[PDB]
Design a protein around this ligand. Structure first.
Ligand SMILES: *[C@@H]1O[C@H](CO)[C@@H](O[C@@H]2O[C@H](CO)[C@@H](O[C@@H]3O[C@H](CO)[C@@H](O)[C@H](O[C@H]4O[C@H](CO)[C@@H](O)[C@H](O)[C@@H]4O)[C@@H]3O)[C@H](O)[C@H]2NC(C)=O)[C@H](O)[C@H]1NC(C)=O
Ligand SMILES: *[C@@H]1O[C@H](CO)[C@@H](O[C@@H]2O[C@H](CO)[C@@H](O[C@@H]3O[C@H](CO)[C@@H](O)[C@H](O)[C@@H]3O)[C@H](O)[C@H]2NC(C)=O)[C@H](O)[C@H]1NC(C)=O
Ligand SMILES: *[C@@H]1O[C@H](CO)[C@@H](O[C@@H]2O[C@H](CO)[C@@H](O)[C@H](O)[C@H]2NC(C)=O)[C@H](O)[C@H]1NC(C)=O
Ligand SMILES: *[C@@H]1O[C@H](CO)[C@@H](O[C@@H]2O[C@H](CO)[C@@H](O)[C@H](O)[C@H]2NC(C)=O)[C@H](O)[C@H]1NC(C)=O
Ligand SMILES: *[C@@H]1O[C@H](CO)[C@@H](O[C@@H]2O[C@H](CO)[C@@H](O)[C@H](O)[C@H]2NC(C)=O)[C@H](O)[C@H]1NC(C)=O
Ligand SMILES: *[C@@H]1O[C@H](CO)[C@@H](O[C@@H]2O[C@H](CO)[C@@H](O)[C@H](O)[C@H]2NC(C)=O)[C@H](O)[C@H]1NC(C)=O
Ligand SMILES: *[C@@H]1O[C@H](CO)[C@@H](O)[C@H](O)[C@H]1NC(C)=O
Ligand SMILES: *[C@@H]1O[C@H](CO)[C@@H](O)[C@H](O)[C@H]1NC(C)=O
Ligand SMILES: *[C@@H]1O[C@H](CO)[C@@H](O)[C@H](O)[C@H]1NC(C)=O
Ligand SMILES: *[C@@H]1O[C@H](CO)[C@@H](O)[C@H](O)[C@H]1NC(C)=O
Lengths: 272, 225, 188, 193, 50, 49
């Protein structure tokens, strides 16, 4: 909010409309990523009131009405696992609220539990969960009688395996390494961007009001120009870092969308 | 927006037209009591009003407020993180104040497209709009000139924080909490199966960019000529 | 800063033994000086008295003495005369103020004794102070610490009579001098 | 009769306040585990100096700082006294006055930066005698006087440790209150590095 | 004066070519996806859903 | 290895730290690439004689 600096910056050109355009581009790209990953369900599917899925137990991953956030137990555990307005920097809120994303995943989960892979193809067609698991065993090459003869054992294995995830998440630290790394990288970028302001950049002083105050305008212009070029360079560096990291996260988000489609909605024969 | 887009027609969407910062009023200066006897003029302080202030040679613009943080008897002004002044003790009354950057944020319009209509709904991002038809607070900022509805539809223009705006009938811009999708509970049972008795074949379009324009810039002719 | 004990000092000093007061470690409110309506002359050289209330100085001197009217014009750079050559000399690049006012009501009765130097074997350097009372040798013959032929006592008294002309009445003079180097400062 | 300077000997760099954050400061400090020269006289002032003294009967008095201390050039002459502490640029000990100031384990840190003299002090309830235990404390109660000379003498007028500050960066942890609970020395050790 | 102009125009050309490199990387990802689709969906029938 | 240059460079800020961090990130990413591609086998298998 310095007028003389405003003029000296104005004479540089269209750099800032360009930087703003890049940042707003990655901003809307993020919403596109989330919407592409999670919004693969046409219509949100309610799960039936009584859970009798052939001995399998989905209480952990299914939403609990008691919780105010209305997200599953493991989702709340994952939220607690991670630990997530100064001068011209603003953080725009994501278009899809966390509750909306939880609702997306609840819909997908109810659909895959009740209707198998039919809901991804089109109208959701419901099969008893045991018979659907038999379908999937036929998919992997094992005949379907193997499930029915061993249904109780398979149910116990699945329940205990889900139970192990809760221990792994609650006790083992740094389970959510990649997501925490994303948060830390973004915090690092914003923090260093703010730190660059204190940097002198070869002028007599970093604080702009001081350099304005104790020099004549003809001489002060040069020092202000050094400050402007340094700060603009730092901001350009932050923008290009954001662009590259946004490309990397877009690749990861496309992978998540493909895995959501090819694995949640349907059974996949691609090994590993 | 016509100006910042360099056009006389803008498409349906939300465009960050400008930025909005509350301007400071009645700048104040303070310096400790002149007990030993050039001198430095000092004036009274204010609260909860974006003001340019000078505290012991430190110049800054913000809203001064009461702060629960206690300094130590020697510390003058404090920095929470990243070398940003966040608290400051006045030299006269020996009292600590917290500084908050007075509200600022992008102003972005919501327009359904010029040929549809000339109505616009302004969105002042992350500004609790107690200050500058119907003014509706949303978790993404303040919305001026958009009616709020209770029912929900599919998202048309992304405002943010789970809220979208659209132009609908008379002939007004409405903001709503977007509907994720239709709600149905497929009738599960342990001995019930739904088998298709017919089918529709469907051709759909998937569009994919594969190339760009092969631009080549003569470095020397562009730089010097 | 103690400008009060300099300007309202009950007794001043003879011009040959001019008093110097060093101002240090204080805040000087110079507005008391130039907002006062009781000064005959307030000549500042190379410095603006209305512009140094937000300024600091590495060194401030205050010189106070007593002369007469037609001699106030000698308290300035590049001047000559009895006062400028043998009593109080200012440099050519003087930075400071020369403040003077009539003191007939204080330094004239019908009991103060103000003196000035008559002769000196050489002119005073700027801000030099000679208080020696040795007999001035004007001729070839050398005096023996006693007055005689071509031998004169170097100090006279001013004849401050209340009925004197304005130019012959006493004037109290304060000379503030400033220095501003790339060094620490204590007078702001 | 040297003795390792332990962790103790760190002061608050500047006036600012920091709550529950780690900071890095680059200025004169007293090195960790650096063998200070315990005296039981004559002492130089190559740079800023950490002075730490323990007296049950408070025998030690103020510090007579001086660049030359030959009466040719101005001294600093910190002394202390039951009623008040008096410091003059100019009693039993002697040797153009510029400035005088009068005002009101025993950690003391004295340093001269661009002609400004700075003092940092601390009072501790010591329980073990003849050793300064490794611990953390600091404050900045100071008097600033623009001398502009390089002091080289102490002549303190019943034993006092003396160590020399060096310009090495430190990492200071800050409490919620804003006090410096702990610090680490960057070049002390590769682990601290 | 020509030094100032050279520096400014060089910075502009540099940021342009960097943004072009990033956009080209995006387009290369899209082109690889399109090649995968043309190979797995036109040259054959694909079982991987959606 | 000139101190006069290094002191002037300090004014610019965290540019060198940022560049070092970016390069070391690329470095660890390369090891991650080789590990992800080749370390798909839990235990080394030897062909029969
Ligand atoms: C599987 O789904 C397909 C959907 O394509 C379905 O084929 C459709 O069958 C209906 C019923 O016969 C067809 O609709 C009729 O088509 C005739 C032409 O052959 C029209 O003349 C009809 O119009 C008259 O009848 C209507 C109903 O009485 C009246 O409302 C109307 O005013 C006319 O009087 C009517 O449109 C339809 O054309 C086909 N679709 C196609 C693409 O062929 C098929 O029968 C389904 N199979 C099973 C086993 O359910
Ligand atoms: C500065 O840091 C200190 C130490 O970390 C904080 O001191 C402690 O603060 C808590 C909460 O303010 C005190 O708990 C309360 O203590 C009172 C009696 O002092 C008691 O009646 C309450 O029920 C409650 O337990 C705690 O006592 C206090 N420790 C002390 C005084 O030794 C202090 O809070 C920090 N400063 C600020 C402004 O927070
Ligand atoms: C599905 O698993 C949940 C989680 O263990 C079961 O809920 C717990 O059941 C035990 C009984 O062994 C209770 O003591 C717990 O209070 C229940 N809640 C929790 C949070 O542990 C649930 O019973 C299982 N489903 C069925 C049908 O038994
Ligand atoms: C500066 O002067 C003001 C003027 O009195 C002092 O303000 C007083 O502070 C005491 C401290 O508790 C209050 O009880 C009084 O009510 C205050 N009076 C007024 C008129 O404000 C202030 O303390 C002085 N500060 C210093 C550092 O000397
Ligand atoms: C939209 O829904 C809100 C739900 O809160 C309605 O606000 C309530 O309206 C009833 C009836 O007028 C009042 O008794 C409540 O006190 C209102 N609650 C709040 C929080 O305002 C609102 O009337 C609805 N509007 C429309 C047009 O349907
Ligand atoms: C303790 O120190 C004070 C210094 O302030 C001594 O008192 C000073 O004595 C001189 C000499 O007459 C006076 O000019 C000062 O005005 C005094 N100052 C004060 C504050 O009283 C004092 O003599 C010393 N010794 C004792 C036993 O008090
Ligand atoms: C936009 O409005 C113009 C009239 O100004 C009309 O000709 C055009 O068809 C409209 N566009 C669409 C997509 O309806
Ligand atoms: C906005 O501010 C007013 C008064 O400052 C307050 O009453 C209100 O709760 C605030 N609303 C939000 C959303 O911050
Ligand atoms: C004392 O001198 C000051 C100048 O320092 C002057 O302003 C004031 O009027 C004097 N006091 C009197 C005349 O009572
Ligand atoms: C005497 O002190 C003053 C400062 O108070 C200084 O300017 C002057 O040079 C000193 N004299 C000598 C001989 O050092």
């Amino acid at each position: 909010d310095s007028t003389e600096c405003s003029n000296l910056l104005l004479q540089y050109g269209s750099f800032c409309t360009q930087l703003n355009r890049a940042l707003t581009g990655i901003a809307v790209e993020q919403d596109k990523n989330t919407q592409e990953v999670f919004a693969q369900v046409k219509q949100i599917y309610k799960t039936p009131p009584i859970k009798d899925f052939g001995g399998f137990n989905f209480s952990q991953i299914l939403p609990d009405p008691s919780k105010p956030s209305k997200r599953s137990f493991i989702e709340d555990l994952l939220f607690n696992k991670v630990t997530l307005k100064f001068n011209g920097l603003t953080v725009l809120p994501p278009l899809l609220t966390d509750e909306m994303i939880a609702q997306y995943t609840s819909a997908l989960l109810a659909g895959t539990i009740t209707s198998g892979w039919t809901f991804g193809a089109g109208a959701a067609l419901q099969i008893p969960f045991a018979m659907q698991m038999a379908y999937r065993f036929n998919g992997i090459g094992v005949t379907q009688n193997v499930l029915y003869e061993n249904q109780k054992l398979i149910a116990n294995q699945f329940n205990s395996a889900i139970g192990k995830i809760q221990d792994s998440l609650s006790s083992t630290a740094s389970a959510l390494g990649k997501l925490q790394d994303v948060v830390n990288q973004n915090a690092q970028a914003l923090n260093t961007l703010v730190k660059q302001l204190s940097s002198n950049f070869g002028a007599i002083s970093s604080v702009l009001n001081d350099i304005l105050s104790r020099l004549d305008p003809p001489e002060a212009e040069v020092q202000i120009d050094r400050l402007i070029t340094g700060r603009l360079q730092s901001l350009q560096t932050y923008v290009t870092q954001q662009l590259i990291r946004a490309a990397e996260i877009r690749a990861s988000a496309n992978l998540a969308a493909t895995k959501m489609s090819e694995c949640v909605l349907g059974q996949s024969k691609r090994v590993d | 927006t016509k100006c910042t887009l360099k056009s006389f027609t803008v498409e349906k969407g939300i465009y960050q037209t400008s930025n909005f910062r509350v301007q400071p009023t009645e700048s104040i200066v303070r310096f400790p009591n002149i007990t030993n006897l050039g001198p430095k003029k000092s004036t009274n302080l204010v609260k909860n009003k974006c003001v340019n202030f000078n505290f012991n040679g430190l110049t800054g613009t913000g809203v001064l407020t009461e702060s629960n943080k206690k300094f130590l008897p020697f510390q003058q002004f404090g920095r929470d993180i990243a070398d940003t002044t966040d608290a400051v003790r006045d030299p006269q009354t020996l009292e600590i104040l917290d500084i908050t950057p007075c509200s600022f944020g992008g102003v972005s319009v919501i327009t359904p497209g010029t040929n549809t209509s000339n109505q616009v709904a302004v969105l002042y991002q992350d500004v609790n709009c107690t200050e500058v038809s119907n003014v509706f607070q949303t978790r993404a900022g303040c919305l001026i000139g958009a009616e709020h509805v209770n029912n929900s539809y599919e998202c048309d223009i992304p405002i943010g924080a789970g809220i979208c705006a659209s132009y609908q009938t008379s002939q007004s811009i409405i903001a709503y909490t977007m509907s994720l999708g239709a709600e149905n509970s497929v009738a599960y049972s342990n001995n019930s199966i739904a088998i298709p008795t017919n089918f529709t074949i469907s051709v759909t379009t998937e569009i994919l960019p594969v190339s760009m324009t092969k631009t080549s810039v003569d470095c020397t002719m562009y730089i010097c000529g | 800063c103690p400008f009060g004990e300099v300007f309202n000092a009950t007794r001043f000093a003879s011009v040959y033994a001019w008093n110097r007061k060093r101002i240090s470690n204080c805040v000087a409110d110079y507005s008391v000086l130039y907002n006062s309506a009781s000064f005959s002359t307030f000549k500042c050289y190379g410095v603006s008295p209305t512009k140094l209330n937000d300024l600091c100085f590495t060194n401030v001197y205050a010189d106070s003495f007593v002369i007469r009217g037609d001699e106030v014009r000698q308290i300035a750079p590049g001047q000559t005369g009895k006062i400028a050559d043998y009593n109080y000399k200012l440099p050519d690049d003087f930075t400071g103020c020369v403040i003077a006012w009539n003191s007939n009501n204080l330094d004239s009765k019908v009991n103060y004794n103000y003196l000035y130097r008559l002769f000196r074997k050489s002119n005073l350097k700027p801000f030099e102070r000679d208080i020696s009372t040795e007999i001035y040798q004007a001729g070839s013959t050398p005096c023996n610490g006693v007055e005689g032929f071509n031998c004169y006592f170097p100090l006279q008294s001013y004849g401050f009579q209340p009925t004197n002309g304005v130019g012959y009445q006493p004037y109290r003079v304060v000379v503030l001098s400033f220095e501003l180097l790339h060094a620490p400062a204590t007078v702001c | 009769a040297y003795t390792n300077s332990f962790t103790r000997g760190v002061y608050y760099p500047d006036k600012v306040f920091r709550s529950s954050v780690l900071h890095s400061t680059q200025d004169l400090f007293l090195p960790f585990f650096s063998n200070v020269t315990w005296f039981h006289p004559v002492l130089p002032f190559n740079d800023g100096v950490y002075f730490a003294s323990t007296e049950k009967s408070n025998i030690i008095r103020g510090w007579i700082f001086g660049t030359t201390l030959d009466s040719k050039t101005q001294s600093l002459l910190i002394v202390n006294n039951a009623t008040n502490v008096v410091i003059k640029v100019c009693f039993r000990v002697y040797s153009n006055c510029t400035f005088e100031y009068v005002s009101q384990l025993r950690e003391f840190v004295f340093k001269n930066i661009d002609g400004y003299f700075k003092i940092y002090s601390k009072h501790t309830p010591i329980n073990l005698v003849r050793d300064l235990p490794q611990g953390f404390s600091a404050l900045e109660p100071l008097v600033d006087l623009p001398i502009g000379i390089n002091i080289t003498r102490f002549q303190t007028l019943a034993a006092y440790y003396v160590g020399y500050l060096q310009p090495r960066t430190f990492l200071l942890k800050y409490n919620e209150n804003g006090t410096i609970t702990d610090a680490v020395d960057c070049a002390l050790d590769p682990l601290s590095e």
